[PDB]
Amino acid sequence: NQLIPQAYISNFHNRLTNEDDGIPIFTMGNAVLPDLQDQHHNPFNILRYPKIRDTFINGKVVSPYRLSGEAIMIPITLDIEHM
Amino acid sequence: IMIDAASSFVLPISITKNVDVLQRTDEILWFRGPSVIVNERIINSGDPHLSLPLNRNEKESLPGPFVLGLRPSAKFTAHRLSMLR
Amino acid sequence: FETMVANPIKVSRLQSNGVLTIHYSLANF
């Protein structure tokens, strides 16, 4: 028991529409993330960081999507308004 | 013969003014029988006061109950406190 | 004072033996 499953959280669209994160895709201690600070082997400690209970509370469950001699590179722009 | 009787009771009136010396719950616990006072826990199993040998009306006022209770002598306790430090 | 029926303290044997002292095992949101 007491182990987190390895997947099933894909909280990406809420950070696309967070309005604090400067992502230009959509329009409509003192550290922030514990990637240098140990937590003495309780996962519950990671719930003190304000951007990480954001990904457990506002998360969802996703299902995994399943699937020449010289390259020619072409840049492609994408500009679509939608709702 | 049952086992799971309550055998302790508490009265509702808070009389907790002069009671800091009794056994409190944390009120006052009131049991269904008295206590039992035991003088000394360890019996002294030899000692012809108690063993009664079969060889050879007399009274003897022994000092205290401490004869019948295996007390250590003080020279060992001082030796062990010297061995302490 | 002689009409003051006392309150039994029940022990409830399974409470007396081994009671320990759930979100704090982080696997259940």
Coordinates of all heavy atoms in Angstrom, one line a residue, chain B:
Chain B
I1 N -19.7 -17.2 35.2 CA -18.7 -16.3 35.8 C -18.3 -15.3 34.7 O -17.6 -15.7 33.7 CB -17.5 -16.9 36.4 CG1 -18.0 -17.8 37.6 CG2 -16.5 -15.9 36.9 CD1 -16.9 -18.8 38.1
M2 N -18.7 -14.0 34.8 CA -18.4 -13.1 33.8 C -17.1 -12.4 34.1 O -16.5 -12.5 35.2 CB -19.5 -12.0 33.7 CG -20.8 -12.5 33.2 SD -22.1 -11.3 33.1 CE -21.5 -10.3 31.7
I3 N -16.6 -11.7 33.0 CA -15.3 -10.9 33.1 C -15.6 -9.5 32.9 O -15.0 -8.6 33.6 CB -14.3 -11.5 32.1 CG1 -14.0 -13.0 32.5 CG2 -13.0 -10.7 32.2 CD1 -13.2 -13.7 31.4
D4 N -16.5 -9.1 31.9 CA -16.6 -7.8 31.4 C -17.5 -6.8 32.2 O -18.1 -6.0 31.6 CB -17.0 -7.8 29.9 CG -16.0 -8.4 29.0 OD1 -14.8 -8.2 29.3 OD2 -16.3 -9.0 28.0
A5 N -17.6 -7.0 33.5 CA -18.3 -6.1 34.3 C -17.5 -4.7 34.4 O -16.3 -4.7 34.1 CB -18.5 -6.6 35.7
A6 N -18.2 -3.7 34.7 CA -17.6 -2.3 34.7 C -16.6 -2.2 35.9 O -15.4 -1.9 35.7 CB -18.6 -1.3 34.7
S7 N -17.1 -2.3 37.1 CA -16.4 -2.3 38.4 C -15.6 -1.0 38.6 O -14.6 -1.0 39.4 CB -15.4 -3.5 38.5 OG -14.3 -3.4 37.6
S8 N -16.0 0.1 38.0 CA -15.6 1.4 38.3 C -16.7 2.4 38.0 O -17.4 2.2 37.0 CB -14.3 1.8 37.7 OG -14.4 2.0 36.3
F9 N -16.8 3.4 38.8 CA -18.0 4.3 38.7 C -17.5 5.7 39.0 O -16.5 6.0 39.6 CB -19.1 3.9 39.6 CG -19.7 2.5 39.3 CD1 -19.3 1.4 39.9 CD2 -20.7 2.4 38.3 CE1 -19.8 0.2 39.6 CE2 -21.2 1.2 38.0 CZ -20.8 0.1 38.6
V10 N -18.2 6.7 38.4 CA -18.0 8.1 38.5 C -19.3 8.8 38.9 O -20.3 8.6 38.2 CB -17.3 8.7 37.3 CG1 -17.2 10.2 37.4 CG2 -16.0 8.1 37.0
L11 N -19.3 9.6 39.9 CA -20.4 10.4 40.3 C -20.5 11.7 39.5 O -19.4 12.2 39.1 CB -20.4 10.8 41.8 CG -20.5 9.6 42.7 CD1 -20.4 10.0 44.2 CD2 -21.8 8.8 42.5
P12 N -21.6 12.3 39.2 CA -21.7 13.4 38.2 C -21.2 14.7 38.8 O -20.8 15.6 38.1 CB -23.2 13.5 37.8 CG -23.9 12.9 39.0 CD -23.0 11.8 39.5
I13 N -21.3 14.9 40.1 CA -21.0 16.2 40.8 C -19.5 16.4 40.7 O -18.7 15.5 41.2 CB -21.6 16.3 42.2 CG1 -23.1 16.2 42.2 CG2 -21.2 17.6 42.8 CD1 -23.7 16.1 43.5
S14 N -19.0 17.5 40.2 CA -17.6 17.8 40.2 C -17.2 18.4 41.6 O -17.4 19.5 41.9 CB -17.3 18.9 39.1 OG -17.9 20.1 39.4
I15 N -16.6 17.5 42.4 CA -16.2 17.8 43.7 C -14.7 18.1 43.7 O -14.0 17.9 44.7 CB -16.6 16.8 44.7 CG1 -18.0 16.3 44.4 CG2 -16.8 17.4 46.1 CD1 -18.5 15.0 45.1
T16 N -14.1 18.4 42.5 CA -12.7 18.4 42.3 C -12.1 19.7 42.9 O -11.7 20.6 42.1 CB -12.3 18.3 40.9 OG1 -12.9 19.3 40.1 CG2 -12.9 16.9 40.4
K17 N -12.2 19.9 44.2 CA -11.6 21.0 44.9 C -10.5 20.7 45.9 O -9.4 21.3 45.9 CB -12.7 21.8 45.6 CG -13.8 22.4 44.7 CD -14.8 23.2 45.5 CE -15.8 23.9 44.6 NZ -16.6 22.9 43.8
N18 N -10.7 19.6 46.7 CA -9.7 19.2 47.7 C -9.2 17.8 47.3 O -8.5 17.2 48.0 CB -10.3 19.1 49.0 CG -10.7 20.5 49.5 OD1 -10.0 21.5 49.4 ND2 -11.9 20.6 50.2
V19 N -9.4 17.4 46.0 CA -9.0 16.1 45.6 C -7.9 16.3 44.5 O -8.2 16.5 43.3 CB -10.2 15.3 45.0 CG1 -9.8 13.9 44.5 CG2 -11.3 15.2 46.1
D20 N -6.7 16.2 45.0 CA -5.5 16.1 44.1 C -4.6 14.9 44.6 O -3.6 14.6 43.9 CB -4.7 17.4 44.1 CG -3.7 17.5 43.0 OD1 -4.1 17.7 41.8 OD2 -2.5 17.4 43.2
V21 N -5.0 14.3 45.7 CA -4.3 13.2 46.3 C -4.8 11.8 45.9 O -4.0 10.9 45.9 CB -4.3 13.4 47.8 CG1 -3.3 12.5 48.5 CG2 -4.1 14.9 48.2
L22 N -6.1 11.7 45.5 CA -6.7 10.5 45.1 C -6.3 10.1 43.7 O -5.4 10.7 43.1 CB -8.2 10.5 45.3 CG -8.7 10.6 46.7 CD1 -10.2 10.9 46.7 CD2 -8.4 9.2 47.3
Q23 N -6.9 9.1 43.1 CA -6.7 8.6 41.8 C -7.8 9.2 40.9 O -8.9 8.8 41.0 CB -6.7 7.1 41.7 CG -6.4 6.6 40.3 CD -6.4 5.1 40.2 OE1 -6.8 4.4 41.2 NE2 -6.1 4.5 39.1
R24 N -7.4 10.2 40.0 CA -8.3 10.8 39.1 C -8.2 10.2 37.7 O -7.3 9.6 37.4 CB -8.0 12.3 39.0 CG -8.2 13.1 40.3 CD -8.0 14.6 40.2 NE -6.6 14.9 40.1 CZ -6.0 15.4 39.0 NH1 -6.7 15.6 37.9 NH2 -4.7 15.6 39.0
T25 N -9.4 10.3 37.0 CA -9.5 9.7 35.6 C -8.6 10.5 34.6 O -7.7 10.0 34.0 CB -10.9 9.7 35.2 OG1 -11.4 11.0 35.1 CG2 -11.8 8.9 36.1
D26 N -8.9 11.8 34.4 CA -8.2 12.6 33.5 C -8.6 12.3 32.0 O -7.8 11.6 31.4 CB -6.7 12.6 33.7 CG -6.3 13.2 35.0 OD1 -7.1 14.0 35.5 OD2 -5.2 13.1 35.5
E27 N -12.3 14.0 37.2 CA -13.2 13.4 38.1 C -12.5 12.5 39.1 O -11.3 12.5 39.2 CB -14.2 12.6 37.3 CG -15.2 13.4 36.4 CD -16.1 12.5 35.6 OE1 -15.9 11.3 35.5 OE2 -17.0 13.1 35.0
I28 N -13.3 11.7 39.8 CA -12.8 10.8 40.8 C -13.3 9.4 40.5 O -14.5 9.2 40.2 CB -13.2 11.1 42.3 CG1 -12.7 12.5 42.6 CG2 -12.6 10.2 43.3 CD1 -13.3 13.1 43.9
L29 N -12.4 8.4 40.5 CA -12.8 7.0 40.2 C -13.3 6.4 41.5 O -12.6 6.5 42.5 CB -11.6 6.3 39.6 CG -11.1 6.8 38.3 CD1 -9.8 6.1 37.8 CD2 -12.2 6.5 37.2
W30 N -14.4 5.7 41.4 CA -15.0 5.0 42.6 C -15.2 3.6 42.2 O -16.1 3.2 41.4 CB -16.3 5.7 42.9 CG -16.1 7.1 43.4 CD1 -16.2 8.2 42.6 CD2 -15.7 7.6 44.7 NE1 -16.0 9.4 43.3 CE2 -15.7 9.0 44.6 CE3 -15.5 7.0 45.9 CZ2 -15.3 9.8 45.7 CZ3 -15.1 7.8 47.0 CH2 -15.1 9.1 46.9
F31 N -14.5 2.7 42.9 CA -14.4 1.3 42.5 C -15.5 0.5 43.2 O -16.3 1.1 44.0 CB -13.1 0.7 42.8 CG -12.0 1.3 41.9 CD1 -11.0 2.1 42.5 CD2 -11.9 1.0 40.6 CE1 -10.0 2.7 41.7 CE2 -10.9 1.5 39.8 CZ -9.9 2.4 40.4
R32 N -15.6 -0.8 43.0 CA -16.7 -1.6 43.5 C -16.2 -2.4 44.7 O -17.0 -3.1 45.4 CB -17.3 -2.5 42.4 CG -18.6 -3.2 42.6 CD -19.0 -3.8 41.3 NE -18.1 -4.8 40.8 CZ -18.2 -5.4 39.6 NH1 -19.1 -4.9 38.7 NH2 -17.3 -6.3 39.2
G33 N -14.9 -2.3 45.0 CA -14.4 -2.9 46.2 C -13.2 -2.1 46.7 O -12.8 -1.1 46.1
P34 N -12.7 -2.4 47.9 CA -11.6 -1.6 48.5 C -10.3 -1.9 47.8 O -10.2 -2.6 46.8 CB -11.6 -2.1 49.9 CG -12.1 -3.5 49.9 CD -13.1 -3.5 48.8
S35 N -9.2 -1.3 48.3 CA -7.9 -1.6 47.9 C -7.3 -2.8 48.7 O -7.9 -3.4 49.6 CB -7.0 -0.4 48.0 OG -6.8 -0.1 49.4
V36 N -6.1 -3.2 48.3 CA -5.3 -4.3 49.0 C -3.9 -3.7 49.3 O -3.2 -3.4 48.4 CB -5.2 -5.6 48.3 CG1 -4.3 -6.5 49.0 CG2 -6.6 -6.2 48.1
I37 N -3.6 -3.6 50.6 CA -2.3 -3.1 51.0 C -1.4 -4.3 51.2 O -1.7 -5.2 52.1 CB -2.4 -2.3 52.3 CG1 -3.3 -1.1 52.1 CG2 -1.0 -1.9 52.7 CD1 -3.6 -0.4 53.4
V38 N -0.3 -4.4 50.5 CA 0.7 -5.5 50.6 C 1.9 -4.9 51.2 O 2.5 -3.9 50.7 CB 1.0 -6.1 49.3 CG1 2.0 -7.2 49.4 CG2 -0.3 -6.7 48.7
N39 N 2.4 -5.4 52.3 CA 3.6 -4.9 53.1 C 4.8 -5.0 52.3 O 5.4 -3.9 51.9 CB 3.8 -5.7 54.4 CG 2.7 -5.4 55.4 OD1 2.2 -4.3 55.6 ND2 2.2 -6.5 56.0
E40 N 5.3 -6.2 51.9 CA 6.5 -6.4 51.2 C 6.2 -7.4 50.1 O 5.6 -8.4 50.3 CB 7.6 -6.9 52.1 CG 8.2 -5.8 52.9 CD 9.2 -6.2 53.9 OE1 9.4 -7.4 54.0 OE2 9.9 -5.3 54.5
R41 N 6.7 -7.2 48.9 CA 6.4 -8.0 47.8 C 7.2 -9.3 47.7 O 6.6 -10.4 47.4 CB 6.6 -7.3 46.4 CG 5.7 -6.0 46.3 CD 4.3 -6.4 46.3 NE 3.4 -5.3 46.2 CZ 2.8 -4.9 45.1 NH1 3.1 -5.5 44.0 NH2 2.0 -3.8 45.1
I42 N 8.5 -9.3 48.1 CA 9.3 -10.5 48.0 C 9.3 -11.2 49.3 O 9.7 -10.7 50.4 CB 10.7 -10.1 47.6 CG1 10.7 -9.5 46.2 CG2 11.7 -11.3 47.6 CD1 12.0 -8.9 45.8
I43 N 9.0 -12.5 49.3 CA 9.0 -13.4 50.5 C 10.5 -13.7 50.7 O 11.3 -13.8 49.8 CB 8.2 -14.6 50.3 CG1 6.7 -14.2 49.9 CG2 8.0 -15.4 51.5 CD1 5.9 -15.4 49.4
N44 N 10.9 -13.9 52.0 CA 12.2 -14.4 52.3 C 12.0 -15.9 52.7 O 11.5 -16.2 53.8 CB 12.8 -13.6 53.5 CG 14.3 -13.9 53.6 OD1 14.8 -14.7 53.0 ND2 14.9 -13.1 54.5
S45 N 12.4 -16.8 51.8 CA 11.9 -18.2 51.9 C 12.6 -19.1 52.9 O 12.1 -20.1 53.2 CB 12.1 -18.8 50.5 OG 11.2 -18.1 49.5
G46 N 13.8 -18.7 53.4 CA 14.5 -19.5 54.4 C 14.1 -19.0 55.8 O 12.9 -19.1 56.1
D47 N 15.0 -18.6 56.6 CA 14.8 -17.8 57.8 C 13.8 -18.5 58.8 O 12.6 -18.2 58.8 CB 14.3 -16.4 57.5 CG 15.4 -15.5 57.2 OD1 16.5 -15.7 57.6 OD2 15.1 -14.4 56.5
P48 N 14.4 -19.4 59.7 CA 13.5 -20.2 60.6 C 12.4 -19.6 61.4 O 11.6 -20.3 62.1 CB 14.5 -20.8 61.6 CG 15.7 -19.9 61.5 CD 15.8 -19.4 60.1
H49 N 12.3 -18.2 61.4 CA 11.0 -17.6 61.6 C 9.9 -18.1 60.7 O 8.7 -18.2 61.1 CB 11.1 -16.1 61.5 CG 12.1 -15.4 62.4 ND1 11.9 -15.2 63.7 CD2 13.4 -15.0 62.1 CE1 13.0 -14.7 64.3 NE2 13.9 -14.5 63.3
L50 N 10.2 -18.4 59.4 CA 9.3 -18.8 58.5 C 9.4 -20.3 58.0 O 8.4 -20.9 57.7 CB 9.3 -17.9 57.2 CG 8.9 -16.5 57.4 CD1 9.1 -15.7 56.1 CD2 7.5 -16.3 57.9
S51 N 10.7 -20.8 58.0 CA 10.9 -22.2 57.5 C 10.4 -23.2 58.4 O 10.0 -24.3 58.0 CB 12.3 -22.3 57.0 OG 13.2 -22.4 58.2
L52 N 10.6 -23.0 59.8 CA 10.2 -23.8 60.9 C 10.9 -25.2 60.8 O 10.3 -26.2 60.3 CB 8.7 -24.0 61.0 CG 8.0 -24.4 62.3 CD1 6.7 -23.8 62.4 CD2 7.8 -25.9 62.4
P53 N 12.2 -25.3 61.1 CA 12.9 -26.6 61.1 C 12.3 -27.5 62.2 O 11.8 -27.0 63.2 CB 14.3 -26.3 61.3 CG 14.3 -25.0 62.1 CD 13.1 -24.2 61.5
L54 N 12.6 -28.8 62.1 CA 12.0 -29.8 63.0 C 12.9 -30.1 64.2 O 12.7 -31.2 64.8 CB 11.7 -31.1 62.3 CG 10.6 -31.0 61.2 CD1 10.5 -32.3 60.4 CD2 9.2 -30.6 61.8
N55 N 13.8 -29.2 64.6 CA 14.7 -29.5 65.7 C 14.7 -28.4 66.7 O 14.7 -27.2 66.3 CB 16.1 -29.6 65.1 CG 16.3 -30.9 64.3 OD1 15.8 -32.0 64.7 ND2 17.0 -30.8 63.2
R56 N 14.6 -28.8 68.0 CA 14.8 -27.9 69.1 C 13.8 -26.8 69.2 O 14.1 -25.8 69.9 CB 16.3 -27.4 69.1 CG 17.3 -28.5 69.2 CD 18.7 -28.0 69.1 NE 19.7 -29.0 69.2 CZ 21.0 -28.8 69.0 NH1 21.5 -27.6 68.8 NH2 21.9 -29.9 69.1
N57 N 7.2 -22.2 74.0 CA 6.5 -21.0 73.8 C 7.5 -19.8 74.0 O 7.8 -19.4 75.1 CB 5.3 -20.8 74.7 CG 4.2 -21.8 74.4 OD1 3.8 -21.9 73.2 ND2 3.6 -22.4 75.4
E58 N 7.9 -19.3 72.8 CA 8.9 -18.2 72.9 C 8.4 -17.1 71.9 O 7.9 -17.4 70.8 CB 10.3 -18.7 72.5 CG 11.0 -19.6 73.5 CD 12.3 -20.0 73.0 OE1 12.7 -19.7 71.9 OE2 13.0 -20.6 73.9
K59 N 8.6 -15.8 72.3 CA 8.3 -14.7 71.5 C 9.5 -13.9 71.1 O 10.6 -14.0 71.7 CB 7.4 -13.8 72.3 CG 6.0 -14.4 72.7 CD 5.1 -13.5 73.5 CE 3.8 -14.1 73.8 NZ 2.9 -13.2 74.5
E60 N 9.4 -13.1 70.0 CA 10.5 -12.3 69.6 C 9.9 -11.1 68.8 O 9.2 -11.3 67.8 CB 11.5 -13.1 68.7 CG 12.7 -12.2 68.2 CD 13.7 -13.0 67.5 OE1 13.5 -14.3 67.3 OE2 14.7 -12.5 67.0
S61 N 10.3 -9.9 69.3 CA 9.8 -8.6 68.7 C 10.9 -8.2 67.7 O 11.9 -7.6 68.1 CB 9.6 -7.6 69.7 OG 10.8 -7.2 70.4
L62 N 10.8 -8.6 66.5 CA 11.8 -8.3 65.5 C 11.6 -6.8 65.0 O 10.5 -6.3 65.1 CB 11.6 -9.2 64.2 CG 10.7 -8.9 63.1 CD1 10.9 -9.8 61.9 CD2 9.2 -8.9 63.5
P63 N 12.7 -6.2 64.6 CA 12.6 -4.8 64.2 C 12.0 -4.8 62.8 O 12.5 -5.3 61.8 CB 14.1 -4.3 64.1 CG 14.9 -5.6 64.0 CD 14.1 -6.6 64.8
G64 N 10.8 -4.2 62.7 CA 10.1 -3.9 61.5 C 9.7 -5.1 60.7 O 9.9 -6.3 61.1
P65 N 9.1 -4.9 59.5 CA 8.9 -6.0 58.5 C 10.1 -6.2 57.6 O 10.1 -7.2 56.8 CB 7.7 -5.6 57.7 CG 7.1 -4.5 58.5 CD 8.2 -3.8 59.2
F66 N 11.1 -5.3 57.7 CA 12.2 -5.3 56.7 C 13.2 -6.5 56.9 O 14.1 -6.6 56.1 CB 13.0 -4.0 56.8 CG 13.5 -3.7 58.2 CD1 14.7 -4.1 58.7 CD2 12.7 -2.9 59.1 CE1 15.2 -3.8 59.9 CE2 13.2 -2.6 60.3 CZ 14.4 -3.0 60.8
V67 N 13.0 -7.3 58.0 CA 13.8 -8.6 58.0 C 13.3 -9.5 57.0 O 14.1 -10.3 56.4 CB 13.6 -9.1 59.5 CG1 14.4 -10.4 59.6 CG2 14.0 -8.1 60.5
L68 N 12.0 -9.5 56.6 CA 11.4 -10.5 55.8 C 11.4 -10.1 54.3 O 10.5 -10.5 53.6 CB 10.0 -10.8 56.2 CG 9.9 -11.3 57.7 CD1 8.4 -11.5 58.0 CD2 10.6 -12.7 57.9
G69 N 12.3 -9.2 53.8 CA 12.1 -8.6 52.5 C 13.3 -8.5 51.6 O 13.2 -7.7 50.6
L70 N 14.4 -9.1 51.9 CA 15.6 -9.1 51.1 C 16.2 -7.7 50.8 O 16.2 -7.3 49.6 CB 15.4 -9.9 49.8 CG 15.5 -11.4 49.7 CD1 14.4 -12.1 50.4 CD2 15.7 -11.8 48.2
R71 N 16.6 -7.0 51.8 CA 17.1 -5.8 51.5 C 18.6 -5.9 51.3 O 19.3 -6.6 52.0 CB 16.8 -4.7 52.6 CG 15.3 -4.4 52.7 CD 14.8 -3.7 51.5 NE 13.4 -3.4 51.7 CZ 12.3 -4.1 51.3 NH1 12.5 -5.3 50.7 NH2 11.1 -3.7 51.5
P72 N 19.2 -5.1 50.4 CA 20.6 -5.1 50.2 C 21.3 -4.3 51.2 O 20.8 -3.4 51.8 CB 20.8 -4.5 48.8 CG 19.7 -3.6 48.7 CD 18.5 -4.2 49.4
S73 N 22.6 -4.7 51.5 CA 23.4 -3.9 52.5 C 24.0 -2.7 51.8 O 24.1 -2.6 50.6 CB 24.4 -4.8 53.1 OG 25.4 -5.2 52.2
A74 N 24.3 -1.7 52.7 CA 24.7 -0.4 52.1 C 26.1 -0.3 51.5 O 26.3 0.5 50.7 CB 24.5 0.6 53.3
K75 N 26.9 -1.3 51.9 CA 28.3 -1.2 51.4 C 28.3 -1.6 49.9 O 29.1 -1.0 49.2 CB 29.2 -2.2 52.2 CG 30.7 -2.1 52.0 CD 31.5 -2.9 53.0 CE 33.0 -2.7 52.8 NZ 33.8 -3.5 53.7
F76 N 27.4 -2.5 49.5 CA 27.3 -2.8 48.1 C 26.7 -1.6 47.3 O 27.1 -1.3 46.2 CB 26.4 -4.0 47.9 CG 26.3 -4.4 46.4 CD1 27.3 -5.1 45.8 CD2 25.1 -4.1 45.7 CE1 27.1 -5.5 44.5 CE2 25.0 -4.5 44.4 CZ 26.0 -5.2 43.8
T77 N 25.8 -0.9 47.9 CA 25.2 0.3 47.2 C 26.2 1.4 47.1 O 26.3 2.1 46.0 CB 23.9 0.7 48.0 OG1 23.1 -0.4 48.1 CG2 23.2 1.8 47.2
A78 N 27.0 1.6 48.1 CA 28.1 2.6 48.0 C 29.2 2.1 47.0 O 29.7 2.9 46.3 CB 28.8 2.8 49.3
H79 N 29.5 0.8 46.9 CA 30.4 0.3 45.9 C 29.9 0.5 44.5 O 30.6 0.8 43.6 CB 30.6 -1.2 46.2 CG 31.7 -1.8 45.4 ND1 31.5 -2.4 44.2 CD2 33.0 -2.0 45.6 CE1 32.6 -2.9 43.7 NE2 33.6 -2.6 44.6
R80 N 28.6 0.3 44.3 CA 28.0 0.5 43.0 C 27.9 1.9 42.6 O 28.0 2.3 41.5 CB 26.6 -0.2 43.0 CG 26.0 -0.3 41.6 CD 26.9 -1.2 40.7 NE 26.4 -1.2 39.3 CZ 25.5 -2.1 38.9 NH1 25.0 -3.0 39.7 NH2 25.1 -2.1 37.6
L81 N 27.6 2.8 43.6 CA 27.7 4.3 43.3 C 29.1 4.8 43.1 O 29.2 5.8 42.4 CB 27.0 5.0 44.4 CG 25.5 4.9 44.5 CD1 24.9 5.5 45.8 CD2 24.8 5.5 43.3
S82 N 30.1 4.1 43.6 CA 31.5 4.4 43.3 C 31.7 3.9 41.9 O 32.5 4.6 41.1 CB 32.4 3.8 44.3 OG 32.4 2.3 44.2
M83 N 31.2 2.7 41.5 CA 31.3 2.3 40.1 C 30.5 3.1 39.1 O 30.7 2.9 37.9 CB 30.9 0.8 40.0 CG 31.8 -0.2 40.7 SD 31.2 -1.9 40.7 CE 31.4 -2.3 38.9
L84 N 29.6 3.9 39.6 CA 28.8 4.8 38.7 C 29.7 5.8 38.0 O 29.7 5.9 36.8 CB 27.7 5.4 39.5 CG 26.6 6.3 38.8 CD1 25.3 6.1 39.6 CD2 27.0 7.8 38.8
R85 N 30.5 6.5 38.8 CA 31.5 7.4 38.2 C 32.7 7.6 39.2 O 33.5 6.7 39.3 CB 30.8 8.8 38.0 CG 31.7 9.8 37.3 CD 31.0 11.1 37.0 NE 30.0 10.9 36.0 CZ 29.1 11.8 35.6 NH1 29.0 13.0 36.3 NH2 28.2 11.5 34.6

